[PDB]
A paper describes a structure:
The trimeric spike (S) glycoprotein of PEDV is responsible for virus-host recognition, membrane fusion, and is the main target for vaccine development and antigenic analysis. The PEDV S consists of an S1 subunit, an S2 subunit, a transmembrane domain (TM), and a cytosolic tail. The S1 subunit can be subdivided into three domains and two subdomains, namely the domain 0 (D0), the N-terminal domain (NTD), the subdomain 1 (SD1), the C-terminal domain (CTD), and the subdomain 2 (SD2). The D0 modulates the enteric tropism of PEDV by binding to sialic acids (SAs) on the surface of enterocytes.
We further obtained recombinant S protein of the PT52 strain using the porcine IPEC-J2 intestinal epithelial cell line, which is the native host cell line for PEDV. Having obtained the recombinant PEDV PT52 S from the IPEC-J2 cells, we subsequently determined its cryo-EM structure to a nominal resolution of 3.1 Å without imposing a symmetry constraint. The structure exhibited a D0UUU arrangement as opposed to the predominantly D0DDD arrangement for the intact virion-derived S protein structure. Through 3D classification, we also observed a minor conformation that adopted a D0UUD arrangement. Orthogonal views of the cryo-EM maps of the D0UUU arrangement (a) and the D0UUD arrangement (c) with their respective atomic models are shown in cartoon representations in b and d, respectively. Instead, the T326I variant populated more D0-down conformation with the 19%, 16% and 42% of the population being in the D0UUD, D0UDD and D0DDD arrangements, respectively.
Numbering used by the authors:
A (entry chain A): 1003 to 1252
B (entry chain A): 702 to 802
C (entry chain C): 803 to 1002
D (entry chain A): 52 to 501
E (entry chain C): 1053 to 1152
F (entry chain B): 803 to 852
């Protein structure tokens, strides 16, 4: 994290610095900063354009009106000014629609922004890859920005993979089908105990956090299938340290 | 005829033109047009990207390869699975405008 | 993406007309800048979302695929060697073939005309050249429809990719079972239990 | 603020040491000698230590000469206090950056790399002329030097002006020395016309008028066709003992100062420096498209035809009515040219009758052919001449940066990169895809097809 | 394209013809009429293009979330993945500038 | 849902004006086409909505 924040901050510190545009474009700093650039430019651009519109002598004798009034009789001056009037209002209209377009868009943005802060910031969200990129969004930060906010979504990316063998389930004594109740888990044996000791471990379906399973994590199943591991009752304490053979204890 | 100038490095490193030739000793043919520069080499790194095309800083032109994304292991019920592990937490950037003035 | 030679779209290269246009400041320039900005953006994000996994591409052909009770013949895209420069390609799925050929008035988007022949200028000029001579350029699609298909194939492969490598391409029945247990733990998956869904 | 020189003049006070001098109110700095590459560190900060503006620092402790690149940055950088490329200070390394391209500091031993900051414009002498219009209050300097001949680095608190013959290009034949009593204007009217015919970068436009046809923009940038191509530049400081007939269709016959294009001009621009030239009447005589001759008389009187313009006043004290006598057989009247403005700076005229005055088209009448001068600048009047430079001029499209209705900087459009720039509106342009026109026939020579 | 056909209250849509038929002042006056017409129509084309650009931008966003949260894996968001019901999964095929 | 008879709207119902209107060709058609397209899309999507 310290790495990433600092050297992203460096990415801020310059443009095309060190040719580090492997992180180029969307979801990268350059994309966001560019966007903000056009953001800050656009308002002044539109306003200036609207202002500059009015100098165009829109089909009239002049870009100003009292000259029209003075030079000719009012009736004709009215005639000419009509064209200027129409030009001015029309440009206003086009500007207006453009502005509303912007308002519509940014309104969509803020809607999403409020969603983002809810779903991503105030808690980490299970919806995959939602928080500005794929992977498990641990959390995110936010910083002010011209008319906007920048969001910094922390997401894990594995560096390795553990090729384990998953177990569909168990059938002890070919009698009792016992299976993990929780879909989000995986039962396996791996590491030195992948096949040497068959030490059974349950870990996240999402990621690698192995530990010994518990009978509390299992449940009965009506139908065995050939995928299920054959098992014996004495193997139940072996498979599960948490199993208890009630009959022998009695 | 209309043409495009690849004003990168604050320079016209290349010109996209329907015309076959230009005042460039280097020229590559594209499926839709011609590109003329002082570098027709194979643009490994697009210093600028546009449509499916990328341009290097020397006037080199090429096609931008798609960036492969992070692998997500599809869920299964049994068999062999590569459980992801030893995660580095990277930060992705996302700016959202909040309002117009 | 579409670009325009606003300068010629108005002046058509008429020098005196160009001088007159100069007084209209950057309105034309702002227009063209906005156009290219939108185009470059569009490009950058669409390239961003497009991420393709090679293992998925492996599993993505029909032969590679194991549509166990899942008849994907129209679903998947056929991958064959393309005599076009010795490269192997995966042709788009039969469904997408129907969608394009029957829907697209020209069947496919590769009909995008090169302006190279437009610069040929020997024979008469078509509509594409008519508009190009009006200063209208049609930038080709940022991403290939074939790239789109292979991306979809990558999506499907990742759908059926049970591991980090190609050694974990489980039968799709297993994936269906997993997703079902995700939405609801199964007390009994009979052969009919899965098969009925498959055949329906 | 030229280099004060190593021995000539008063000057001296050469620092040229690791003494790390820190003087205020400095507007010129020069290094005339890095002994190969031995260190040189300059920190130019606003004296009140204001981080709001962009700080400036140059650093080269390494002694690789060509590869001992002076890390240069006009950026909101650490206002370095004692020594070091960053050091302990205020402001972080990347607070705000304007320019940071580390320009290599390779130079000859007697070569001088210098920077001057004045009039909110910056000139840099790092192997070239880097002239820019940019705000600056940078009178704080903290240095580190390695002694090189005792005359390596100096601060410059006063402007020194060197007259250069330039008999030869290069270190040889410049005949450089602080000279002439025509200090400012003749240092602000001369230039070395580029072989293409342009003003060399570094010109400050002491009096140069942008040609606004009706009303002048106070501030901004405009692309327009203005006569910025230079033909046979003539820069004679306060001497015109000449009876001359400037004629179009002919490259103006004079001692062409810079690498002039020997082109028959269509316009001509002045950097006049004495006003009494106008008092010496006959300074403007004219022959127009009709061939009608034309006189110019300026004097306090307002009626040639009711009174004599025999001037009873000298050195103005009255805006002298300029009347313009028609000199054809059936028209011999004095048209009122203009009430003499309080102070003229530059006058430009064009082939097609454009009498242009101080950014204004007073007449811009039908085409002129013979713009003939009789300014009685003879005898002691050879030191009374207002003629200080005159340059034949060809129209050229260029982008002009101006502020406070004062010319700041220029950019021609002939070069394709420059063509795109002037096709755009900003001198600088961004890396992207830009529209462009296929190059037509440079020679128009369009055949007729009917 | 068809805008160039429209002689915007000028005597012709041919700039060179206008120069031919008029003195420079009046010619520049008339050509300005079509100059304005061309510029205006072009502007409207611009805005509508941006309109489409914007909406398709939102569209591709939606597709992106749909693929991530449904295609990449079935969503707990009931009804979200292309309608109500127990959406077990979904499959995507290419389409002109789009996806199924 | 709103539509307009472009032809009579502009031509005031005058065919002699429709002569000139035809010269703008799809200028008239595109308006109404898009209008009805949006209307029908809205109708179908909200019918499926309910
Ligand atoms: C204030 O406002 C007035 C209003 O008229 C301006 O006067 C005009 O200024 C323009 C700006 O340069 C002049 O344009 C020049 O015209 C010259 C004469 O025109 C002939 O040549 C052109 C071009 O060949 C023909 O189109 C025309 O029909 C004439 O035959 C030309 O010599 C100039 O052209 C140069 O460049 C072209 C290439 O573009 C070359 O082929 C030419 O050989 C030449 O090198 C240029 O076109 C215009 O002439 C002025 N009007 C009149 C009546 O002369 C003022 O300039 C303006 N500013 C002030 C007063 O400061
Ligand atoms: C077409 O013309 C251009 C413009 O001259 C050529 O580009 C540049 O050509 C020089 C001359 O060789 C190349 O310089 C070489 O590499 C370095 C650069 O400093 C140095 O060791 C020498 O100067 C050496 O000559 C330069 O790299 C090259 N730049 C490019 C290609 O971007 C070009 O080579 C010409 N030929 C073509 C394009 O086929
Ligand atoms: C966390 O990271 C920050 C970076 O933001 C570190 O703060 C920085 O620490 C330096 C140490 O002095 C501060 O001064 C700088 O020192 C260098 C070296 O002397 C000098 O060259 C610079 O000019 C500057 O004076 C700096 O202001 C400060 N902040 C920055 C760089 O933004 C901090 O040390 C880190 N801490 C941990 C626990 O990781
Ligand atoms: C043009 O530039 C000159 C720069 O020298 C500005 O000052 C004028 O400079 C000349 C130098 O040749 C002075 O001439 C000298 O005048 C004194 C007395 O007037 C005389 O004793 C000397 O022998 C010599 O001839 C001139 O006086 C001086 N002008 C002054 C002091 O007002 C000039 O202001 C610039 N003008 C423009 C319009 O650019
Ligand atoms: C250069 O100037 C000389 C006149 O001598 C100058 O005196 C000073 C003004 C000094 O600054 C230098 O310019 C000169 O030393 C002009 O003619 C030369 O005169 C000298 C005098 O003996 C003679 O030896 C040379 O041969 C002359 N010619 C030269 C130097 O080319 C000369 O016209 C001026 N300009 C040029 C371009 O040389
Ligand atoms: C566990 O025991 C069951 C029951 O014997 C085994 O299931 C048999 O598998 C073979 C393999 O082809 C079939 O021919 C038999 O018909 C199956 N008998 C059944 C289902 O009653 C199973 O193979 C054993 N091992 C595992 C891992 O399940
Ligand atoms: C040069 O650039 C082109 C891209 O336009 C690449 O094209 C290859 O050219 C060789 C020449 O014989 C062919 O055999 C290959 O099949 C081409 N590759 C493809 C994918 O079609 C080429 O790879 C580039 N050269 C490099 C990168 O060294
Ligand atoms: C981090 O990734 C490594 C690489 O697979 C995992 O294994 C390490 O491998 C290196 C290779 O020489 C050994 O030196 C280390 O002892 C191994 N373990 C560790 C903790 O580094 C490693 O397990 C991964 N870390 C985590 C927390 O999963
Ligand atoms: C799986 O799908 C394929 C094609 O999607 C089916 O094969 C086609 O069936 C039609 C039925 O009329 C025949 O006309 C075609 O000749 C068949 N082959 C093609 C289109 O290549 C097939 O029947 C489906 N079921 C399977 C294979 O069990
Ligand atoms: C995962 O897939 C592989 C291939 O489909 C299965 O087969 C093993 O492949 C590896 C090579 O990668 C060999 O070393 C093993 O000997 C193979 N297994 C057997 C039983 O021979 C593999 O079993 C699967 N499961 C894993 C790797 O845990
Ligand atoms: C910052 O990013 C670049 C590019 O990925 C990387 O090479 C560098 O090591 C990173 N630095 C830190 C401190 O994370
Ligand atoms: C002044 O004008 C006369 C003709 O009017 C001309 O012969 C002479 O060359 C001009 N100049 C001088 C200095 O007499
Ligand atoms: C113009 O110049 C040409 C060539 O220099 C010459 O032949 C012609 O006579 C000149 N005409 C005038 C009116 O100066
Ligand atoms: C004065 O006018 C006559 C004819 O109008 C002409 O021949 C003569 O050249 C003019 N004077 C000068 C100095 O050119
Ligand atoms: C001046 O012009 C008029 C107009 O034709 C003419 O009648 C008269 O003779 C001219 N004056 C002369 C030639 O002195």
């Amino acid at each position: 994290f310290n790495s990433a924040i600092g050297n992203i901050t460096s990415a801020f510190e310059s443009v095309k610095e060190a040719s580090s545009q492997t992180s180029r474009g969307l979801n990268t700093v350059a994309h966001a900063l560019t966007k903000v650039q056009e953001v800050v430019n656009s308002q002044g651009a539109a306003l200036t354009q609207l202002t500059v519109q009015l100098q165009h002598n829109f089909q009239a004798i002049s870009s100003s009106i009292d000259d029209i009034y003075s030079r000719l009789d009012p009736p004709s001056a009215d005639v000419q000014v009509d064209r200027l009037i129409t030009g001015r209002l029309s440009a206003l209209n086009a500007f207006v629609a453009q502005t509303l377009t912007k308002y519509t868009e940014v309104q969509a943005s803020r809607k999403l922004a409020q969603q983002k802060v809810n779903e991503c910031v105030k808690s980490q969200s299970q919806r995959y890859g939602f928080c500005g990129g794929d992977g498990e969004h641990i959390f995110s930060l936010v910083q002010a920005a011209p008319q906007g906010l920048l969001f910094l979504h922390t997401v894990l990316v594995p560096s390795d993979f553990v090729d384990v063998i998953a177990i569909a389930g168990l059938c002890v004594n070919d009698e009792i089908a016992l299976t993990l109740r929780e879909p989000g888990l995986v039962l396996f044996t791996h590491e030195l105990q992948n096949h040497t000791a068959t030490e059974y471990f349950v870990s996240s379906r999402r990621m690698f956090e192995p530990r010994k399973p518990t009978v509390s994590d299992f449940v009965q199943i009506e139908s065995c299938v050939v995928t299920y591991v054959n098992l014996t009752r004495d193997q139940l304490p072996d498979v599960i340290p948490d199993y208890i053979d009630v009959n022998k204890t009695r | 005829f209309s043409e495009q100038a690849a004003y990168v490095d604050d320079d016209i490193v290349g010109v996209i033109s329907s015309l076959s030739s230009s005042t460039f000793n280097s020229t590559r043919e594209l499926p839709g047009f011609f590109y003329h520069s002082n570098d027709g080499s194979n643009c490994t790194e697009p210093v600028l990207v546009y449509s499916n095309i990328g341009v290097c800083k020397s006037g080199s032109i090429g096609y931008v390869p798609s960036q492969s994304g992070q692998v997500k292991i599809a869920p299964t019920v049994t068999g062999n699975i590569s459980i992801p592990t030893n995660f580095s937490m990277s930060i992705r950037t996302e700016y959202l405008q909040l309002y117009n003035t | 993406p579409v670009s325009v030679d606003c300068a010629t779209y108005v002046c058509n290269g008429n020098s005196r007309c160009k001088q007159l246009l100069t007084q209209y400041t950057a309105a034309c320039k702002t227009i063209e800048s906005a156009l290219q900005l939108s185009a470059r953006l569009e490009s950058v994000e669409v390239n961003s979302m497009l991420t393709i996994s090679e293992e998925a591409l492996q599993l993505a052909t029909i032969s590679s695929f194991n549509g166990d009770g899942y008849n994907f013949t129209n679903v998947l895209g056929v991958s064959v060697y393309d005599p076009a420069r010795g490269r192997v390609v995966q042709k788009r799925s039969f469904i997408e073939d129907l969608l394009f050929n029957k829907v697209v008035t020209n069947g496919l988007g590769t009909v995008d005309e090169d302006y190279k022949r437009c610069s040929n200028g020997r024979s008469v000029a078509d509509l594409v050249c008519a508009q190009y001579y009006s200063g209208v350029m049609v930038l080709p699609g940022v991403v290939d429809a074939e790239k789109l298909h292979m991306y979809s194939a990558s999506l499907i492969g990742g759908m059926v990719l049970g591991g980090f490598t190609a050694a974990a391409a489980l039968p799709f029945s297993y994936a269906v079972q997993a997703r079902l247990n995700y939405l609801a733990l199964q007390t009994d998956v009979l052969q009919r239990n899965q098969q009925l869904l498959a055949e329906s | 603020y030229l280099p004060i020189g190593e021995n000539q003049g008063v000057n001296s006070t050469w620092y040229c040491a690791g003494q790390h001098p820190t003087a205020s109110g400095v507007h010129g700095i020069f290094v005339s000698h890095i002994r190969g590459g031995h260190g040189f560190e300059i920190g130019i900060s606003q004296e009140p230590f204001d981080p709001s503006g962009y700080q400036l620092y140059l650093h080269k402790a390494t002694n690789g000469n060509t590869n001992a690149t002076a890390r240069l940055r006009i950026c909101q950088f650490p206002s370095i206090k004692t020594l070091g490329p960053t050091a302990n200070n205020d402001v972080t390394i990347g607070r705000n950056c304007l320019f940071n391209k580390a320009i290599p500091a390779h130079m000859s031993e007697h070569s001088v790399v210098g920077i001057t900051w004045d009039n909110d414009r910056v000139t840099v002498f790092s192997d070239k002329i880097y002239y820019f219009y940019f705000k600056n209050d940078w009178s704080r300097v903290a240095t580190k030097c390695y002694n090189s001949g005792g005359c390596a680095m100096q601060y410059v608190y006063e402007p020194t002006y060197y007259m250069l013959n330039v008999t030869s290009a290069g270190e040889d034949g410049i005949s450089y020395q602080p000279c002439t009593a025509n200090c400012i204007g003749y240092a602000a009217n001369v230039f070395a016309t580029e072989p293409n015919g342009h003003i060399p970068e570094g010109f400050s436009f002491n009096n140069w008028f942008l040609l606004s046809n009706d009303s002048t923009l106070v501030h901004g940038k405009v692309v327009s066709n203005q006569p910025l191509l230079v033909n046979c530049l003539l820069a004679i400081p306060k001497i015109y003992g000449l009876g001359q007939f400037f004629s179009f269709n002919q490259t103006i016959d004079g001692v062409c100062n810079g690498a002039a294009v020997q082109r028959a001009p269509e316009a001509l621009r002045f950097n006049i420096n004495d006003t009494s030239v106008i008092l010496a009447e006959g300074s403007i005589v004219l022959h127009t498209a009709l061939g009608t001759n034309f006189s110019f008389v300026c004097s306090n009187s307002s009626n040639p035809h009711l009174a004599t313009f025999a001037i009873p006043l000298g050195a103005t004290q009255v805006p002298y009515y300029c009347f313009f006598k028609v000199d054809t057989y059936n028209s011999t009247v004095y048209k009122f040219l203009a009430v003499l403005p309080p102070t003229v700076r530059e006058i430009v005229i064009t082939k097609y009758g454009d009498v242009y005055v101080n950014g204004f088209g007073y007449l811009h009448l039908g085409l002129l052919d013979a713009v003939t001068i009789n300014f009685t600048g003879h005898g002691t009047d050879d030191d009374v001449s207002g003629f200080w430079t005159i340059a034949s001029t060809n129209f050229v499209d260029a982008l002009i940066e101006v502020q406070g209705t004062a010319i700041q900087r220029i950019l021609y459009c002939d070069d394709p990169v420059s063509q795109l720039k002037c096709s755009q509106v900003a001198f600088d342009l961004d890396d992207g895809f830009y529209p462009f026109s296929s190059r037509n026939l440079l020679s128009h020579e369009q055949p007729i097809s009917f």
